[PDB]
Write an enzyme that holds these catalytic residues in place. Structure first.
Site, PDB file in Angstrom:
ATOM      1  N   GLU A  72     -17.348  27.795  39.279  1.00  0.00           N
ATOM      2  CA  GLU A  72     -16.586  26.608  38.932  1.00  0.00           C
ATOM      3  C   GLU A  72     -15.709  26.177  40.109  1.00  0.00           C
ATOM      4  O   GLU A  72     -15.503  26.945  41.048  1.00  0.00           O
ATOM      5  CB  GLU A  72     -15.743  26.845  37.678  1.00  0.00           C
ATOM      6  CG  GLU A  72     -14.809  28.044  37.864  1.00  0.00           C
ATOM      7  CD  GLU A  72     -13.644  27.989  36.874  1.00  0.00           C
ATOM      8  OE1 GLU A  72     -12.695  27.226  37.157  1.00  0.00           O
ATOM      9  OE2 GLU A  72     -13.727  28.712  35.858  1.00  0.00           O
ATOM     10  N   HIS A 101     -12.354  20.383  29.906  1.00  0.00           N
ATOM     11  CA  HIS A 101     -12.210  21.818  30.077  1.00  0.00           C
ATOM     12  C   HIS A 101     -13.211  22.545  29.176  1.00  0.00           C
ATOM     13  O   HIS A 101     -12.824  23.163  28.186  1.00  0.00           O
ATOM     14  CB  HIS A 101     -10.764  22.252  29.828  1.00  0.00           C
ATOM     15  CG  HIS A 101     -10.539  23.740  29.956  1.00  0.00           C
ATOM     16  ND1 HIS A 101     -10.976  24.474  31.045  1.00  0.00           N
ATOM     17  CD2 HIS A 101      -9.918  24.622  29.121  1.00  0.00           C
ATOM     18  CE1 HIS A 101     -10.630  25.739  30.863  1.00  0.00           C
ATOM     19  NE2 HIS A 101      -9.974  25.830  29.670  1.00  0.00           N
TER      20      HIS A 101
END
Length: 109
Positions: A72, A101
């Site tokens: 990420e 998120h």
């Protein structure tokens, strides 16, 4: 160089086969004295975001077979609250963005 947009970072990945160098890891921020409990990154480690840190995936929201690994990186995070708008890419470079998120993803590939 100093790129931190969805398209921009995704481009760098595709092109150079790496993140931009403006993204340090959590460990590095921490060394520079950043604390997560404390405030925003730039305060302690300016000119930096988080990226290149592991996403893992427990095989659900993003696809995985054989043993596809994931990493990420932050999108748009200088000051404010912690990164949340984020972008996650696989080892074999299948790219998905999020603003929520890791609730829902969308491929940019």
């Amino acid at each position: 160089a100093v790129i931190n947009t969805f398209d921009g970072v995704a481009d760098y990945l595709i092109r150079y086969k790496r993140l931009p160098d403006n993204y340090i890891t959590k460990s590095q921020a921490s060394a520079l004295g950043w604390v997560a409990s404390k405030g925003n990154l730039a305060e302690v480690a300016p000119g930096k975001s988080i990226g290149g840190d592991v996403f893992s995936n427990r095989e659900g929201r993003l696809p995985s077979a054989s043993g596809r690994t994931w990493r990420e990186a932050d999108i748009n995070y200088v000051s404010g609250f912690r990164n949340a708008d984020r972008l996650v890419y696989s080892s074999d470079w299948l790219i998905y963005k999020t603003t929520d998120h890791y609730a829902t993803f969308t491929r940019i590939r």
